[PDB]
Amino acid sequence: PETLLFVSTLDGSLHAVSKRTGSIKWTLKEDPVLQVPPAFLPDPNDGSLYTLEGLTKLPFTIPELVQASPCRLYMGKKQDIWYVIDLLLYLGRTEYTITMYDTKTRELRWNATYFDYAASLPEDDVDYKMSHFVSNGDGLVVTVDSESGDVLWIQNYASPVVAFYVWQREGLRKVMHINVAVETLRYLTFMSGEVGRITKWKYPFPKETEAKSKLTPTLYVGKYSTSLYASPSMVHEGVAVVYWLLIGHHETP
Amino acid sequence: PETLLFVSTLDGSLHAVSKRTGSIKWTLKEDPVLQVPPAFLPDPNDGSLYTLEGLTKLPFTIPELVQASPCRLYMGKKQDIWYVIDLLLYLGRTEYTITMYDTKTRELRWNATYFDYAASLPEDDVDYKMSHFVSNGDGLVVTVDSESGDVLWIQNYASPVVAFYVWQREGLRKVMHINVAVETLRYLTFMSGEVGRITKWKYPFPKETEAKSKLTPTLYVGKYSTSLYASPSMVHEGVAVVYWLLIGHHETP
């Protein structure tokens, strides 16, 4: 179980992936990370919240807003579930539901239902020499050796990956990753292969630092079964940066 | 609405009481403050937890244990409800449900369901010249002018009062009170009247300081429809201080 990588995606799919190949061993399909039933743009990656009066980021996440209600009208909720699955691992997720409400009118101004795996905070452990690159609005993943920039594996999961978990010390430990645009991520994987071919010695790829350095901070807004959502991302040269009108990138709020 | 005092009792009764008389204007009957379905002794006054290996107090309350799960097996939950009632006041309470669980066995080691009104923390506001004395395992209340010790009113509610709320700035503000044993509280109200009679000038009563000073810290353990619970309390001379065997007082853990 210490060789598995857990891939949490937007539609509820948790993937038991080979930290080596990146291939699926077993797929667990549950509740979709977000279910905003427009008002607030959630962040599949941690309940963060945004609003569009341009595009701004509030100061409280979804859980926080919940673990701080009633308030003034705010309705909070927080049921927990544990998942039992023999490879037996006890993985637990939390269903956070929030609710806006105006005493003036008589309707639910806003609503959202953001799930999220209980896991230990991510810490820069030198023992982890891997780095993961993720596409916004797409299941593309570029796992590329942290101690170089040497591409370890490319994968395309059904739905966009929202978070990564490694089962350290019997239980999940969230592994920090990078958000890059499909365009740029493909464009990058492309060159990686070209340089790989002309060279014939390894498929290069930027390092989290070079990447986060040379690209350009953007705030991506995606769509999910009629549920919008922002989420930081990097974009390269020649990518438009501001319903189909709101979707896509925007300049960091 | 600024003249009402809200009396939260163990069986779910919220009382709209005259901050002057102490009499009920309107009664709101909802879910009982505790519903431990023996293991952990809850505290109707804030989810605090205790265990009896004598009688000790853990470091985390019920909400905290919930707003910190899943964990390791701990199951948390936190639905909120708002109550609308025209005197219209919007009072909100939170239903906290917790759950213990051993991966070893296959049964729910423990469980509890503690409700609690959303209200602003209590602060020593010099504008509030009242003091409330409460009996453990009884609906006796001795409201006695803070700026003296002069008895303002005596009341006996159906079920034991767990907390007091004052609707300051449109919304509840929890008012700190004192936990004394029925015995002592009756014994006190008694003398108060005797001295009142021989004197014919006012019914005295200790001040939160004299009381909390001359009495003796005890940890009361009560019972509620087959649900035990600890809860600090003061006791005077000649009161036994250690199921009917556990109920009653004990020396401060």
Side-chain angles (χ1 to χ4, degrees), chain A residues 1 4-17 22-24 26-28 30-44 46-52 54-68 70 73-78 80 82-85 87 90 92 94-101 110-123 128 130-145 149 151-165 171-172 174-193 195-196 199 202-206 208-209 211 215-217 219-236 238-242 244-245 247-250 253, chain B residues 1 4-17 22-24 26-28 30-44 46-52 54-68 70 73-78 80 82-85 87 90 92 94-101 110-123 128 130-145 149 151-165 171-172 174-193 195-196 199 202-206 208-209 211 215-217 219-236 238-242 244-245 247-250 253:
Chain A
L4 296 188
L5 192 304
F6 294 89
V7 187
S8 179
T9 70
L10 260 191
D11 71 3
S13 296
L14 183 68
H15 294 300
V17 157
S23 327
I24 295 179
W26 45 272
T27 288
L28 197 174
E30 303 310 316
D31 294 284
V33 187
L34 276 64
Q35 308 189 64
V36 174
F40 292 85
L41 291 182
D43 191 315
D46 67 20
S48 302
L49 252 39
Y50 294 85
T51 51
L52 44 61
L55 222 283
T56 50
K57 184 185 184 184
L58 306 175
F60 51 102
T61 88
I62 285 282
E64 300 190 357
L65 198 57
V66 185
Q67 292 172 293
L73 248 58
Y74 286 44
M75 300 273 274
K77 179 148 175 286
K78 175 195 176 302
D80 293 14
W82 278 91
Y83 285 134
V84 204
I85 39 188
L87 323 68
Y90 279 118
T94 310
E95 171 188 304
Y96 297 88
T97 305
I98 184 75
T99 279
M100 232 56 99
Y101 192 113
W110 190 60
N111 171 295
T113 304
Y114 161 72
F115 286 70
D116 184 352
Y117 283 96
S120 58
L121 286 64
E123 187 183 304
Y128 198 47
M130 242 149 75
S131 231
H132 306 75
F133 278 100
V134 174
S135 55
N136 296 57
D138 223 293
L140 184 66
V141 180
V142 190
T143 295
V144 59
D145 168 73
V151 165
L152 251 138
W153 52 269
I154 294 287
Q155 282 291 178
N156 183 69
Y157 304 103
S159 176
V161 169
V162 288
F164 290 95
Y165 310 112
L172 310 179
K174 175 144 161 288
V175 191
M176 176 229 68
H177 69 194
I178 319 180
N179 265 196
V180 65
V182 222
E183 293 80 304
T184 318
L185 195 60
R186 295 216 205 82
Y187 181 72
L188 250 25
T189 318
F190 171 52
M191 308 209 276
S192 167
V195 167
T199 263
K202 101 294 172 57
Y203 294 135
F205 209 92
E208 179 167 309
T209 59
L215 285 354
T216 296
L219 189 266
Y220 175 93
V221 173
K223 187 203 102 62
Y224 182 102
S225 183
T226 69
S227 311
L228 304 194
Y229 69 87
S231 166
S233 185
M234 305 177 286
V235 99
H236 75 325
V239 177
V241 301
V242 188
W244 59 278
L245 282 168
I247 298 167
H249 295 39
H250 298 258
Chain B
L4 296 188
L5 192 304
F6 294 89
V7 187
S8 179
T9 70
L10 260 191
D11 71 3
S13 296
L14 183 68
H15 294 300
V17 157
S23 327
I24 295 179
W26 45 272
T27 288
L28 197 174
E30 303 310 316
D31 294 284
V33 187
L34 276 64
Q35 308 189 64
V36 174
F40 292 85
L41 291 182
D43 191 315
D46 67 20
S48 302
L49 252 39
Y50 294 85
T51 51
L52 44 61
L55 222 283
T56 50
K57 184 185 184 184
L58 306 175
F60 51 102
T61 88
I62 285 282
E64 300 190 357
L65 198 57
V66 185
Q67 292 172 293
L73 248 58
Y74 286 44
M75 300 273 274
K77 179 148 175 286
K78 175 195 176 302
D80 293 14
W82 278 91
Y83 285 134
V84 204
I85 39 188
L87 323 68
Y90 279 118
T94 310
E95 171 188 304
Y96 297 88
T97 305
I98 184 75
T99 279
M100 232 56 99
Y101 192 113
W110 190 60
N111 171 295
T113 304
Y114 161 72
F115 286 70
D116 184 352
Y117 283 96
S120 58
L121 286 64
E123 187 183 304
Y128 198 47
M130 242 149 75
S131 231
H132 306 75
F133 278 100
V134 174
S135 55
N136 296 57
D138 223 293
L140 184 66
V141 180
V142 190
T143 295
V144 59
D145 168 73
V151 165
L152 251 138
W153 52 269
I154 294 287
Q155 282 291 178
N156 183 69
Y157 304 103
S159 176
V161 169
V162 288
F164 290 95
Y165 310 112
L172 310 179
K174 175 144 161 288
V175 191
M176 176 229 68
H177 69 194
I178 319 180
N179 265 196
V180 65
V182 222
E183 293 80 304
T184 318
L185 195 60
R186 295 216 205 82
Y187 181 72
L188 250 25
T189 318
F190 171 52
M191 308 209 276
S192 167
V195 167
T199 263
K202 101 294 172 57
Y203 294 135
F205 209 92
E208 179 167 309
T209 59
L215 285 354
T216 296
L219 189 266
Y220 175 93
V221 173
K223 187 203 102 62
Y224 182 102
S225 183
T226 69
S227 311
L228 304 194
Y229 69 87
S231 166
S233 185
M234 305 177 286
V235 99
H236 75 325
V239 177
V241 301
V242 188
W244 59 278
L245 282 168
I247 298 167
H249 295 39
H250 298 258

